[PDB]
Ligand SMILES: Cc1cc2nc3c(=O)[nH]c(=O)nc-3n(C[C@H](O)[C@H](O)[C@H](O)COP(=O)(O)OP(=O)(O)OC[C@H]3O[C@@H](n4cnc5c(N)ncnc54)[C@H](O)[C@@H]3O)c2cc1C
Ligand SMILES: Cc1cc2nc3c(=O)[nH]c(=O)nc-3n(C[C@H](O)[C@H](O)[C@H](O)COP(=O)(O)OP(=O)(O)OC[C@H]3O[C@@H](n4cnc5c(N)ncnc54)[C@H](O)[C@@H]3O)c2cc1C
Ligand SMILES: Cc1cc2oc(=O)c(Cc3cccc4ccccc34)c(O)c2cc1C
């Protein structure tokens with residue numbers, strides 16, 4: 032009996048995206064998960080960080096710094112009721128599903144803001160315990176994305192280039208960075224040009240995947256241990272590590288590709 | 302003379318970003334440029350896609366689809382007046398500058414939403430002429446970014462990983478997709494640790510660059526001519542091209558790395 036959070040980001044109950052989340056929650060429940068949702072549009076959600084994210088007095092209103100004030104606000108418990116109720120949903124979850132349409136090659140603005148407003152220092156990340164040492168280490172996150180263009184268009188020779196680089200800033204920068212383990216993305220390509228019968232199976236496969244999803248092995252990111260964590264060493268990869276790698280033909284990651292070959296589907300397949 | 306448009310996405314008049322936007326406008330004016338602004342936060346820009354973007358009447362309100370509904374609104378002149386004003390600024394502009402702090406390894410949610418509401422199909426991109434043949438092919442954009450992390454953290458060895466991969470979805474996907482000639486990003490690392498006297502230098506270096514911006518050499522992107530531009534062919538790289546690259550050490554760019562080694566600083570250097 033674990034705990035799932037489904038974050039949607041689509042205006043229409045009409046959308047395949049909405050179907051995807053409804054399918055997501057049904058599957059989850061019949062296997063006994065308790066499920067909570069953040070339907071951003073339906074929530075009248077405000078996606079813009081500002082001082083107004085802070086209940087009371089600002090430490091230094093003369094020179095507003097979002098990072099420090101929000102953190103303080105988080106500690107003293109002075110955050111817009113808004114943010115508070117989301118942050119709670121998070122700590123309570125084991126799994127977090129992010130459901131969205133790909134918009135300009137990343138997350139919708141409203142989803143982006145949700146990260147920016149909900150993922151507050153101390154609560155979600157730490158400068159000390161960055162990445163795989165994050166507060167979310169006990170949790171798993173996954174992107175379920177739908178797309179206009181085809182797998183072909185997003186393949187190594189496709190006009191849009193590799194979908195793995197496009198996934199990187201989000202899956203690593205935003206999910207792994209907070210500690211999350213990230214499962215392979217669910218990618219629904221060319222959803223506008225999928226015959227009506229494939230679209231009924233896709234929803235079904237998604238539901239099957241969900242039945243055993245806690246047991247999947249996650250995407251691979253280069254451990255934080257491979258790096259010297261300070262401004263002295265530059266947060267750089269240890270010499271001993273940079274050395275074992277001299278003769279390995281593939282980089283470690285998309286981000287840590289090292290001028291070498293990116294390991295096939297590093298951001299798409301475990 | 303020539304025209305610039307400076308889109309800014311920071312809330313504080315006291316920030317280095319606002320300062321940076323000022324310097325650009327200042328320096329650019331002293332050359333003869335006509336400078337226009339979008340201080341997103343000051344304009345209280347609405348960043349959220351919705352049916353309220355179409356003033357007219359929906360072709361198909363039952364199952365609402367933003368792409369086609371918005372593109373039709375475009376053609377007929379039924380786009381919401383605030384979006385329209387933004388688009389007139391883009392038409393007029395020869396050079397567009399995006400000034401912002403890197404937030405969660407990308408663009409502030411308000412800038413994302415600005416792209417989503419204002420880059421409407423057929424106004425800003427053509428499915429029949431994606432990328433280098435796009436509407437804005439006659440203009441030039443540049444990203445001006447400030448960061449918390451140091452450049453070291455964003456080197457091939459840095460904990461955050463190659464900054465070129467991070468710049469990719471924005472420079473190719475958002476800017477270049479529209480036809481933009483993308484110029485080298487102005488990268489200001491860890492501005493919040495930069496000695497007071499140092500920040501003045503950066504500020505004036507920025508003014509110095511802008512003196513001769515229009516003659517810069519743009520970042521390199523695979524020309525669309527390398528690809529068969531139709532869905533039947535999967536928008537795959539041309540057969541002849543694929544062969545005449547089989548014996549090339551390096552990929553074409555970050556997205557078209559072809560599973561080989563990425564060329565150094567492809568999203569950072571011309
Ligand atoms: C602003 C914007 C930016 C975009 N950027 C990109 C981009 O960068 N790259 C890219 O590749 N694409 C892009 N597209 C994204 C593409 O349109 C979306 O990623 C995708 O369309 C999301 O699909 P949807 O949920 O809205 O599908 P829908 O519009 O809802 O359509 C899905 C199909 O499934 C049907 N359907 C609906 N519900 C069900 C159900 N319950 N059961 C079975 N079938 C159902 C629908 O009738 C429809 O035929 C962009 C679109 C927009 C508006
Ligand atoms: C939500 C969020 C997410 C972030 N995510 C990331 C991330 O993913 N990766 C990352 O590396 N970083 C991240 N940071 C990014 C980092 O905060 C910004 O890039 C950086 O803070 C931008 O500085 P600023 O202009 O906003 O702030 P400021 O502190 O205002 O920068 C200006 C500095 O120069 C001084 N100054 C102001 N005006 C002038 C002037 N005219 N001349 C000289 N000095 C001046 C100011 O006092 C200040 O010391 C994040 C920050 C936030 C809030
Ligand atoms: C930033 C952006 C990227 C996109 O990428 C895409 O692949 C598609 C799908 C697509 C784009 C162009 C031609 C097509 C042809 C057939 C099927 C899908 C096609 C988009 O509709 C699309 C829309 C926007 C706003």
Ligand SMILES: Cc1cc2oc(=O)c(Cc3cccc4ccccc34)c(O)c2cc1C
Nearest residue numbers: 158159204208404405406449450451454494
């Ligand atoms: C998503 C995110 C990424 C970040 O990356 C960074 O490199 C820094 C700067 C930074 C990060 C970690 C340790 C530091 C130590 C000293 C100075 C800056 C330091 C961020 O403050 C930061 C903040 C957020 C929200």
